[PDB]
Design a protein around this nucleic acid. Sequence first.
DNA 1: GCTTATCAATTTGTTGCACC
DNA 2: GGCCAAAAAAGCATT
DNA 3: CGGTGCAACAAATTGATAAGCAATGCTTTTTTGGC
Lengths: 96, 94
Amino acid sequence: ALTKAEMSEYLFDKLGLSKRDAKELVELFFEEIRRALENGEQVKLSGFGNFDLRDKNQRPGRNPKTGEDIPITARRVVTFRPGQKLKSRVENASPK
Amino acid sequence: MTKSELIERLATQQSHIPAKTVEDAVKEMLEHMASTLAQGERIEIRGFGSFSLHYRAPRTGRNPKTGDKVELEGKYVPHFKPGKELRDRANIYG
DNA sequence: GCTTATCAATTTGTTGCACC
DNA sequence: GGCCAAAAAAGCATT
DNA sequence: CGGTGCAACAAATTGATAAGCAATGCTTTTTTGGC
């Protein structure tokens, strides 16, 4: 799996950034996205996808193991809608 | 917030890192994520989420406008799963 | 229209990555 | 940075 | 740089309700490269 460490190393190798800055940058990129999202704003990254917020009303759920009917509480969740560009690049992938 | 807006916001707060560098980095980071998924490998950023690949079996779909059938090949689609920190920070409701 | 995802609670095996 | 025309990408219809 | 511990990760249960999508032309936004 790709990690922040791998991302930093990549920024270092490709852009010649100091390992300090590469590290901070990766961290910031993700943080900025979180900031927008927690702030109710949609994030649209052209060529990748959109991170949208959906408000879900309470609905019936259950403790899977037992069967005890428990409600899934109302909540605001973050979803990702991959764009056509990303989707095409991935359609013919083969899990490594 | 678009890609460019994300870049501007980062540059702004990181006065010590050159704006051009920030732009290049964001672009590079995204391309890296993209190619990773294109290679069939997953992405896992603790506190943000993970991107995995989901399989879709071949099927006889329809062109929704005309109704004609279309033979669809099996394939892979990206799937994002928000991590704990992101879920919690996003959820405004209890 | 039909397919796929969302989620409950809980246990168990794995890992990103902060912190030394 | 701004502005601009052109191209790429996405948004919409409905998806 | 590298060792380490642990919260955050993954997976697995069932079933009612929510969300997403096959094609593709036209419209709208966003990126791009030059000034």
